[PDB]
Amino acid sequence: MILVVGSLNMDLVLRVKRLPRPGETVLGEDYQTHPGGKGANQAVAIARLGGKVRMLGRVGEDPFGQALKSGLAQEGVDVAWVLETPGPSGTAFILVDPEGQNQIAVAPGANARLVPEDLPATAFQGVGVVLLQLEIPLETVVRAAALGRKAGARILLNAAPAHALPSEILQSVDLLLVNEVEAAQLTEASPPRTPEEALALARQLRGRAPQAQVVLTLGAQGAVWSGTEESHFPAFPVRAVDTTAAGDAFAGALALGLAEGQNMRAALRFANAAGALATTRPGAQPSLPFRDEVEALLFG
Amino acid sequence: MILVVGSLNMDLRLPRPGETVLGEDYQTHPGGKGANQAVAIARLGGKVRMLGRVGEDPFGQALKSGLAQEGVDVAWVLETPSGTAFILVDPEGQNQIAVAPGANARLVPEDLPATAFQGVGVVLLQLEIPLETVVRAAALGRKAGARILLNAAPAHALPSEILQSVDLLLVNEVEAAQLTEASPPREALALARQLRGQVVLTLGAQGAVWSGESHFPAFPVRAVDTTAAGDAFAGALALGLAEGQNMRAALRFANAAGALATTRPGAQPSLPFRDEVEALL
Ligand SMILES: Nc1ncnc2c1ncn2[C@@H]1O[C@H](COP(=O)(O)OP(=O)(O)O)[C@@H](O)[C@H]1O
Ligand SMILES: Nc1ncnc2c1ncn2[C@@H]1O[C@H](COP(=O)(O)OP(=O)(O)O)[C@H](O)[C@H]1O
Predict the structure, then answer these.
(1) How far, CA to CA in Å, does B25 sit from each of B50, B92, B99, B198, B258?
(2) C-alpha angle with apex B52: B48 to B53, nearest 5 degrees?
């Protein structure tokens, strides 16, 4: 059983010729509205892969709030710990170009009101893995890890979007999951390139600031893992339509792989499979693949 | 009055990929080049009508009642089965914008009644509606006996037919280049607008040039947000000519509105009132 603690966002999406550079006005088409948020996406990702999942976070007392909560319940995620909030739900401004590269700006809304006291112990009882991200306040992330350990869950921190982390969080996490910008933020010096070797060396560096399994995602180059092994796990070759929610599929698939009892080798392959499929359909949450697609792609 | 025919938009800590500016603002205000130009005239104490399409969504209502509360006649604003700008802004006033035309793409020639043009002194147009509707709006303006002000913005190619049918052709340095060829590195901007040519070429903090042959200096101000500077200038110029001011005093009156727009954040909210622009005289 997995608990996901994190954000619920309404995604407002535009197809664009080209992502605007600073100062640029670009013309877009095909305006669309879908439930999203790193938290809600990772919960739904676990559900479509057939894992049992609860979601703990806040929606606002607006139309979107109901749509965010109902969306989750419909996918069969347990929404008993989704709390109603004065003011607006989270909203996200997404642009996607023809290569599937995106640009996202998030208005936190009710996600900013998820405080430590909002975390009851019964949401964590009997869960094997707690899955956290950073579209909620850092004091809430600390409490979630604490309550997670107290219940005997593995703490999976997806440190995204990019944010500075205090030692208290980095030291209390079983697995730290970051993309290259998050890895560079926390380490200083980017991998302005890949060799898969370069981000292994940075994932070894991030390893120094804790005692977790460290996982670094590389988009079209897959992922690396510094922990009980130092290894690269290649991407599945697919046609990428919209890269939105691919880290969410991957995070959610890693969580459920470890929940179900898979080792890291298997769970990371499973996760690259799921993150690859998410690139091949448009939109965030709607692109989240189902167990049988993911298993098809693994079987080859 | 002045008739404005063009766009209405609602203008609305980031996954970077491709990259966003490090800055945290957006929320909700009426915008679009048409709406902004109309509100500009209204805030400058001018009688003004807005002609264009909103959607059947909450925004559509908000845009309409928004323009109304500023003092714009919205009678001719047609509901449609809204245009949206996703605006990201950093603390240094730098912007990234993604526009979804919505209803604005559905404003077709047969949408323009001649009633709306009757008695008006200036028809003010931009290029945020289909080109065939701009053509219609010009033709109906000429019929009603109005001066047709084309603001050829945003940057787009135009045929000789359209260029030859307007009484004033308002452009910036990128649009000037688009229609002619080769950016004015300045004057050379005045020799480019004569290659165009009444043609008005805006130059930011260097003000505006004219030839039908003169340059009108910028009002020096603290530029925090250059958004809606073109809209305030366009709206103000349109109001100076409909008020019967000379071209020289109107272009000074445009620069003065233009400069005051730069001094406050956002688009429609930064548009100066009359008392403000008259003080800067
Ligand atoms: N073009 C791609 N081809 C194959 N897999 C991809 C592609 N883009 C992303 N992925 C998968 O999704 C995961 C997340 O990619 P990445 O861009 O690092 O995440 P995020 O969207 O959080 O930045 C990768 O590890 C990989 O499994
Ligand atoms: N920094 C500035 N200082 C003074 N006046 C300015 C400044 N920026 C713009 N303006 C005024 O507002 C207008 C700005 O239009 P401009 O920046 O040339 O093109 P755009 O249509 O892209 O906004 C007029 O050109 C000018 O009078």
Answers:
(1) 28, 11, 17, 39, 23
(2) 140
DSSP A113: G
**Rounded Cα–Cα distance for residues B216 and A222 (Å):** 58
Q: CA nearest B97 in A: which residue?
A: A25
Protein residues whose CB sits closer than 6 Å to any atom of ligand 1: A 160, 179, 217-220, 222-223, 235-236, 238, 240, 243, 246-247, 250, 272, 275-276, 279; B 17
Among A28, A106, A107, whose Cβ lies nearest the Cβ of B98? A28
B231 is catalytic: yes
Residues 6+ positions from B66 with CB-CB distance below 8 Å: B30, B35
Q: Is the dihedral of CA A241, A244, A246, A249 positive or negative?
A: negative
A160/B98 Cβ within 8 A: no
Cβ within 8 Å, pair A22-B94: yes
Could you give the domains of chain A? 2-299 (3.40.1190.20)
Which burial class, exposed, middle or buried, applies to B142 when counting CB atoms under 10 A from its CB (0-12, 13-18, 19+)? Answer: middle
Q: Contact at 8 Å (CB) between A59 and A8?
A: yes
The H-or-E segment that residue B16 falls in is: none
Measured between alpha carbons, how far is A148 from A3 in angstroms, rounded to an integer? 9
- Confirm or deny that A220 is annotated as ligand binding: yes
Distance CA B266, CA B227 (A): 6
- Token digits of residue B106: 């559905």
Please name the method used to determine this structure: X-ray
Helix (H, G, I), strand (E, B) or coil at B173: helix
Do residues A61 and B56 lie in contact, with contact meaning Cβ atoms separated by under 8 Å? no
Collapsing DSSP states into helix, strand and coil, what is residue B126? Answer: coil
